[PDB]
Design a protein around this ligand. Structure first.
Ligand SMILES: CCCCCCCCCCCCCCCCCC(=O)OC[C@H](COP(=O)([O-])OCC(O)COP(=O)([O-])OC[C@@H](COC(=O)CCCCCCCCCCCCCCCCC)OC(=O)CCCCCCCCCCCCCCCCC)OC(=O)CCCCCCCCCCCCCCCCC
Ligand SMILES: CCCCCCCCCCCCCCCCCC(=O)OC[C@H](COP(=O)([O-])OCC(O)COP(=O)([O-])OC[C@@H](COC(=O)CCCCCCCCCCCCCCCCC)OC(=O)CCCCCCCCCCCCCCCCC)OC(=O)CCCCCCCCCCCCCCCCC
Ligand SMILES: CCCCCCCC/C=C\CCCCCCCC(=O)OC[C@H](COP(=O)(O)OCCN)OC(=O)CCCCCCC/C=C\CCCCCCCC
Ligand code: HEC
Ligand code: HEM
Ligand code: HEM
Ligand SMILES: COC(=O)N(OC)c1ccccc1COc1ccn(-c2ccc(Cl)cc2)n1
Lengths: 62, 79, 239, 378, 64
């Protein structure tokens, strides 16, 4: 009866609910700068060649 | 004065419960849930729906008779 | 007073839910207001300040303000003098009063345009369909001194001679300046003017849909965890 | 020695939200009471911003609002949060009233009567907020109220002149409409604490209409996590209407400025007043039309007296369920008629639907409950 | 220049020709007698509404 990989770190960090009181602060990363994969790479792909920083090399260093 | 030890009188009733960590949070979901939400739809469809059908027929008669009272004039438009 | 003609749906390049505006078609459409008009229309809510970063950099922008001459205030050892565009200036009105306005146009004042597509029931599809929809007055419609028959107008009798035709203008990078191309660019203008928050509104709406695609299935399974005690309970009656 | 049962401030919170006995079969229709408390708080922390940058006069009102969407930083998001947040308040209010009408919650007499006062106060507040931006719909909508407010036979002509700032359309009109709009949302916040103190004497009703004292559960954690999930689904719908179509609920003619310049192509208010504008417009008398406007909201107070059924709710009453949904379809008709011009098919329809709204509540509903009483052999 | 040629083939649609022909059938009805104010703004609205629908479906490809 080998279990699955849901014993994540339950015996290591999550038992004594020390994590739960401060996940607004401590467990808070991986979801602003790791989501450069998110909206900005999607939004500029639907609007390729239409934003200002696409038509930009045409009008500096002239 | 409405607190839990002072509510009502009860005799001869037994309840059994399981811990939330001992059970799966998603049991039968499409096996039980889809046949359940279909007979709930059948039980209430003859009470709720026939009023909103009569609103639809009055809305279509009211917008179509508005136009051919106004500037839609094929044949009543002579001397 | 009989019926009205409503504008059709044109497939604009900003019509979609995550679509930006074309920032080359605002530059071409600013000059359809600047050099083909402002002889009737004021646009008293947009400046030469708000054009930077949308369709011009800040030089190429001040030079269009140091081209018109408007009256500044007074200065001592003198009186009311002239000093042109100080980088933050609204667009110049043509008429000194509504008294002199409608006398120049046979009893009608052409309105301001800085909110004109937000103020009509067609958006920027209405402005396009009226600029390029002129006809001749049909049989029986005896119109007076100042009435040109436009079927996309309330009352069929706008006091507007047609303002644009083939090559009233030529653009800065080279573009065939036909009449529909003139009107399409000025209707990509006057929508950015009414709604300058357009592209910021849709990019912020994309991060909202991705964060609530995380929070919502996770609050729901937390609710599902507490309520499973009551959903699994059994009852028995032994009198 | 349990601190949440003995501290003087903590034990008030514990009896109200934590250890409160609640029925176990409460549905999602009981979510909209805490949603109304979220919408009222949100309209206060957003009306802060707008009244800061504001000037209310006949010469500058239309431009004081256009200054915020362009020049004032984060002003386009906060303005359309406020205009759509008031449409969200009114959809959460009509669901809330229709719940208590369907399940017989009006038998809680003191809680129901404070509710009818709350329905009048938010309706009069939002009327005095749409007059503030000063466009065509602000002018011609305000100047049909005073035609029926000067129709009061004795005091009415000096009543409207006392609230118009002193004469007519002028600078000080929007100093008494704006005063009657800054301060009325705070009488609502005090009337809501009294509203819940009367409900605490009995607890909540439930969808079966039977008392549930043998099957109570604590409020925490079962309905604290269920009210948080329902509030998250409300913020998703509100931010979609703000960030993807912020002018869907609105009128373009209120972007045309206010002036007695020219008669507008139409006159219509926001969507949540269209049922009331359709009723008074179908009465050709400015005194009979102002009486049937107040009689369309204060008719809710007669609902405890008109009850003739032996059961409380409508869960086991199939003939009464048909009449409840005929009343909902009658209010959809009045919302459509109230945005139509006054022409041939929309006068005979708009005045027969004004009759049927009063015929269902007063006559058809008490007779049908008696017929269902006889069929169950009581 | 692209509009004046896109508008040309949009008239030979069968939904647009029978909106055109009884516009011109009523032309010799107004200038015939003196006892009339039978205008031709109804007959021309159905022409322009049937025509400008198909123009919007095709005009924006030939632009920008
Ligand atoms: C009209 C309505 C006005 C309300 C509008 C907002 C104004 C806020 C306000 O009224 O402030 C009241 C203010 C705090 O109100 P609150 O934080 O909003 O909530 C009330 C709490 O019951 C107040 O908590 P407490 O004072 O009963 O705590 C007792 C004590 C005991 O707490 C403990 O030691 C842990 C025991 C578990 C507590 C579990 C609480 C249940 C949840 O706490 C501590 O020893 C340390 C505090 C722990 C951190 C505080 C954050 C937790 C809350 O109350 C006081 O000022 C207490 C008087 C302090 C004088 C001390 C004199 C002895 C020295
Ligand atoms: C069946 C139909 C409903 C039957 C009506 C009786 C039950 C409803 C009720 O009592 O609400 C009273 C109240 C009207 O009753 P009332 O004219 O004030 O008193 C005569 C009754 O006999 C009621 O007199 P009472 O027996 O309730 O005498 C105690 C009275 C006196 O106690 C107080 O009100 C204390 C005064 C507050 C002082 C703090 C002021 C803060 C500023 O307490 C109240 O009336 C408070 C209930 C209303 C809250 C308004 C207070 C503002 C907070 O309901 C309303 O708020 C408006 C509804 C009016 C139509 C309902 C009756 C016609 C059918
Ligand atoms: C006015 C402008 C418009 C206001 C908003 C209108 C909102 C549209 C309402 C459409 C929602 C339809 C809900 C569909 C769910 C449904 O009907 O299923 C039937 C279902 C059956 O369940 P039970 O009765 O418990 O079991 C009985 C077994 N025989 O019925 C219910 O869910 C009960 C209905 C609860 C009422 C909740 C509010 C309903 C909205 C009606 C709005 C009426 C407003 C009246 C207030 C007027 C104030 C001036
Ligand atoms: C021949 C002078 C003149 C020219 C040039 C002109 N207009 Fe007009 N237009 C008028 C007049 C006069 C009115 C107001 C008519 C009235 O109010 O009865 C008007 C009205 C309008 C309206 C309102 C239409 C309506 O339904 O109320 C719009 C929009 C408009 N003009 C846009 C433009 C644009 C864009 C341009 C630049 C391409 C332009 N106009 C150039 C004369 C002109
Ligand atoms: C600002 C307005 C209001 C607020 C903040 C508010 C708040 C609440 C809350 C929090 C509850 C308890 C939870 C629930 O059952 O949803 C409740 C219940 C109730 N409300 Fe309101 N309410 C408001 C308006 C009204 C109105 C307009 C009415 C009726 C005309 C009304 C009548 C009732 C009734 C009868 C109940 C008890 C229902 C039951 O338990 O079955 N309230 N209200
Ligand atoms: C129950 C709460 C409220 C409701 C239903 C409400 C409703 C409204 C409505 C309908 C408008 C018109 C918006 C528009 O037409 O564009 C508005 C704007 C306004 N509100 Fe409120 N409001 C509430 C709370 C407040 C508060 C708490 C304040 C002041 C602190 C306030 C002050 C204003 C002002 C000054 C405006 C004008 C600004 C503008 O039009 O954008 N309101 N509100
Ligand atoms: C958002 O504001 C509008 O919709 N307003 O007012 C500026 C408007 C705008 C144009 C035309 C008409 C109105 C108002 O129409 C009605 C119809 C009924 N009420 C009403 C008001 C208060 C109370 Cl207590 C009860 C009933 N108002």
């Amino acid at each position: 009866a080998a279990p699955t990989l849901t014993a994540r770190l339950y015996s290591l960090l999550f038992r004594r609910t020390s994590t739960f009181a401060l996940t607004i602060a401590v467990g808070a990363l991986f979801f602003e700068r790791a989501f450069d994969q998110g909206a900005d790479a999607i939004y500029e792909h639907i609007n390729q060649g239409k934003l200002w920083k696409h038509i930009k090399h045409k009008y500096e260093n002239k | 004065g409405r607190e839990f030890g002072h509510l009502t009188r009860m005799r001869h009733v037994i309840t059994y419960s399981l811990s939330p960590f001992e059970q799966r949070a998603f049991p039968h979901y499409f096996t039980k849930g889809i046949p359940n939400v279909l007979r709930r739809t059948r039980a209430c469809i003859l009470r709720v729906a026939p009023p909103f059908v009569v609103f639809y027929l009055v809305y279509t008669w009211g917008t179509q008779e508005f136009e051919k009272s106004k500037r839609k004039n094929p044949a009543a438009y002579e001397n | 007073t009989d019926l009205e003609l409503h504008a059709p749906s044109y497939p604009w390049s900003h019509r979609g839910l995550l679509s930006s505006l074309d920032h080359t078609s605002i530059r071409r459409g600013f000059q359809v207001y600047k050099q083909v008009c402002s002889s009737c229309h004021s646009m008293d809510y947009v400046a030469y300040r708000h054009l930077v970063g949308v369709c011009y950099t800040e030089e190429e922008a001040k030079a269009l303000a140091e081209e018109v001459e408007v009256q500044d205030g007074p200065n001592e050892d003198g009186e009311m003098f002239m000093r042109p565009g100080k980088l933050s200036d609204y667009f110049p009105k043509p008429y000194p009063n509504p008294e002199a306005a409608r006398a120049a146009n046979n009893g009608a004042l052409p309105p301001d345009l800085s909110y004109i597509v937000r103020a009509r029931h067609g958006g920027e599809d209405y402005v396009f369909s009226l600029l390029t929809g002129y006809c001749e007055p049909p049989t029986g419609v005896s119109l007076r001194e100042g009435l040109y028959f436009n079927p996309y107008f309330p009352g069929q009798a706008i006091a507007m001679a047609p303002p644009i035709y083939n090559e009233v203008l030529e653009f800065d990078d080279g573009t065939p300046a036909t009449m529909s191309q003139v009107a399409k660019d000025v209707c990509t203008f006057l929508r950015w003017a009414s709604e300058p928050e357009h592209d910021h509104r849709k990019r912020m709406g994309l991060k909202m849909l991705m964060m609530m695609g995380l929070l919502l299935p996770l609050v729901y399974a937390m609710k599902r965890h507490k309520w499973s005690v009551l959903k699994s309970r059994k009852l028995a009656y032994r009198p | 020695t349990n601190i949440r049962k003995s501290h003087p401030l903590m034990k008030i919170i514990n009896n109200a939200f934590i250890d409160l006995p609640a029925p176990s079969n409460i549905s999602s229709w009981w979510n909209f009471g805490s949603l109304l408390g979220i919408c009222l708080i949100l309209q206060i922390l957003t009306g802060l911003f707008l009244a800061m940058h504001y000037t209310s006069d006949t010469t500058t009102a239309f431009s004081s609002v256009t200054h915020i969407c362009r020049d004032v930083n984060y002003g386009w998001v906060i303005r359309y949060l406020h205009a759509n947040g008031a449409s969200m308040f009114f959809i959460c209010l009509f669901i809330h009233v229709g719940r208590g009408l369907y399940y017989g919650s009006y038998m809680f007499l003191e809680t129901w009567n404070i509710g009818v006062v709350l329905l009048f106060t938010v309706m009069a507040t939002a009327f005095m907020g749409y007059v503030l931006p000063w466009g065509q719909m602000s002018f011609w909508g305000a100047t049909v109220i005073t035609n029926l407010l000067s129709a009061i036979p004795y005091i009415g002509t000096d009543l409207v002149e006392w609230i118009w700032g002193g004469f007519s359309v002028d600078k000080a009109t929007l100093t008494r409409f704006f005063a009657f709009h800054f301060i009325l949302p705070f009488i609502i916040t005090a009337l809501a604490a009294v509203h819940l103190l009367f409900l605490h004497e009995t607890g909540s009703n439930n969808p079966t209409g039977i008392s549930s004292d043998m099957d109570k559960i604590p409020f925490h954690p079962y309905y604290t996590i269920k009210d948080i999930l329902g509030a998250l689904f409300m913020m998703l719908i509100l931010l979609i209407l703000v960030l993807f179509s912020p002018d869907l609920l609105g009128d373009p003619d209120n972007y045309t400025p206010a002036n007695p310049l020219n008669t507008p192509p139409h006159i219509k208010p926001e969507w949540y007043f269209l049922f009331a504008y359709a009723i008074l417009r179908s009465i050709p008398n400015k005194l009979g039309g102002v009486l049937a406007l107040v009689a369309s909201i204060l008719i809710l107070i007669l609902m405890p007296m008109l009850h003739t059924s032996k059961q409380r709710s409508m869960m086991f009453r199939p003939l009464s369920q048909c009449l409840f949904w005929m009343l909902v379809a009658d209010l959809i008709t009045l919302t459509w008629i109230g945005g139509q011009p006054v022409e041939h098919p929309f006068i005979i329809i708009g005045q027969l639907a004004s009759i049927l709204y009063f015929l269902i509540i007063l006559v058809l509903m008490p007779i049908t409950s008696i017929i269902e009483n006889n069929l169950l052999k009581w | 220049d692209p509009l004046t040629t896109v508008r040309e083939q949009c008239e030979q649609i069968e939904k647009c020709i029978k909106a055109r022909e009884r516009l011109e059938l009523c032309d010799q009805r107004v200038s015939s007698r003196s006892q009339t104010e039978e205008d031709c703004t109804e007959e021309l609205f159905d022409f322009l509404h049937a025509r400008d629908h198909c123009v919007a479906h095709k005009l924006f490809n030939s632009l920008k």
